[PDB]
Structure 1
Amino acid sequence: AEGDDPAKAAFDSLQASATEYIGYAWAMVVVIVGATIGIKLFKKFTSKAS
């Protein structure tokens, strides 16, 4: 009871932190995927010309 309470809260904190890192992962991939959509679009143009 008493010992594990501070630990439980510590875990809540760690989990939230984990959520922040995760948000950043989502954004990073946002950039990578933005890149893939645009470049793939250039190839699309190549096709229109062809």
Structure 2
Amino acid sequence: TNYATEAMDSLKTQAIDLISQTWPVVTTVVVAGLVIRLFKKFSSKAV
């Protein structure tokens, strides 16, 4: 409609901004959970 398609476009613009907002948290959790593993791995390799 005039309304329903406008509503879905509003919802999609909510969702895309929400996803682009979630990705920094995903990187700073996953990458920091892997550096803390690489450190253990190469520290054990170092000795």
TM-score by length of 1: 0.72
Matched, 1:9 2:1: no
Q: Following the alignment from structure 1 to structure 2, what is the Cα–Cα distance between the partners of residues 41 and 27?
A: 21
Structure 1 unmatched runs, 5+: none
Per the alignment, in what secondary structure is the counterpart of residue 5 of structure 1? Answer: coil
2:39 partner letter: F
Q: Which has the larger radius of gyration?
A: 1
Superposition map of 1:28-43 within 5 A: 28-43=25-40
Offset at 1:37?
A: 2.0
Q: TM-score, normalised by structure 2?
A: 0.75
Aligned length: 47
Structure 2 unaligned blocks of 5 or more:
none
The share of aligned pairs that are identical, in percent, is: 43
